[model samples]
Target: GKSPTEVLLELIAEASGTTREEVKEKFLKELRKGKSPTEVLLELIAEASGTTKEEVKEKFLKELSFGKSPTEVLLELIAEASGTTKEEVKKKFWKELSL
Candidate 1:
């Protein structure tokens, strides 16, 4: 298994790129945390955007093998949530994705 920092770095490296639900139970439990929905979404967005190619193989396989969306999808979702124009969002996406 890959180390946590490696995963964090992987996320940091890509911080971009394209594109879940559990049995609702695991996910619902995750949602139960005391963070704002926006904050949670933002964090997940940040997390999804973060990562490098080498680390992606490590993280993506670990995450996807378990069923999860790639960071790419999170970008648009966040872009829309950002209230910035879609054009602006895309323009800003890669640069801002950095941790």
Candidate 2:
């Protein structure tokens, strides 16, 4: 039941080997550079965890079986986990999903 910001901070901390506060500060700095929190969180997770966004998308589609497209599943996971929007999630999927 974490907020989007909290979930994002946790993801960043997990991936970056940094404290949540550090990740939150860096994330906010990135936001000032015109990056969305969603984009910043996704990049941090992929980089720190050595996992791609596409991988998460695929897993979500496989596990959820919600009849949603890969793109839809990606958005659902993010939204359900973080209170982000499906559209924002879809945009990230389009950027990351290759198959």
Candidate 3:
């Protein structure tokens, strides 16, 4: 199986029309700027699919509520893909959303 970072870079690279290395740099840069890891994931996913951040966020929550696995899968990717732990990512994700 591909490492989470590998899959994430491929997806973001394909969507953002950039190389995986570039995506990695940007991902770290954004995280350094105090952006939540999950927020960056949502932004990348939004850019990849041509959706607004808010739209992507709402879709994620909606999909999560419906028991679709992709939501959790993507959320898991957001952690290791961004050099964070799953618990940290979950804390940041929920805190950012004020949930």
Candidate 4:
């Protein structure tokens, strides 16, 4: 099985076309809190978009409660962080998931 960092690096590197070393280094600092890379990515996106993880998660949950797919919400968050459109973010990453 792949480690959390390994999977995360794979995901980000594939989506962003960034080097594995860069992806690892970019996220590893946040991982020092012993959080999973998934959580770290959430926090990183939140911070990048001038929000908090709790705030982002709150919005995510609210959107989900409104019948939004997790993938949709995450893509919106990623777009928010990267300052791009959700459609663009979708093109850059996977598009299917369940909440």
lDDT of all predictions: 0.41, 0.58, 0.65, 0.64
> How well does each candidate superpose onto the true structure, as a TM-score?
0.29, 0.47, 0.60, 0.58
**Candidate 3 weakest lDDT stretch, 10 residues:** 1-10
Off by over 4 Å in 3: 70-99
Tell me, what's the RMSD of every candidate? 13.6, 11.2, 10.8, 5.6
lDDT tens readout by residue for model 3, 1-99: 145545555555755678888877888899999997667777786766566889777776676788877646565545534555767665654554442
- TM-score of candidate 4 against the unseen true structure: 0.58
Q: Which residue pairs show backbone clashes in model 3?
A: none
Candidate 1 residue-wise lDDT, 15-82, digit = tens: 33322222123224646976543334445444454533344345434655666665543344445444
Say which prediction, candidate 1 or candidate 3, comes out ahead on TM-score. 3
Clashes of each: 11, 0, 0, 0
- Give the poorly placed runs of model 4, Cα more than 4 Å off: 1-38, 94-99
Candidate 3, position 21, lDDT: 82
Per-residue C-alpha lDDT of model 2 across residues 1-99, encoded as one tens digit per residue:
146456546544644668878878888898999986656665555556467867654566465575645434434555544445657655544544432
lDDT of 2: 0.58
lDDT of 4: 0.64
Q: Best by lDDT, which number?
A: 3
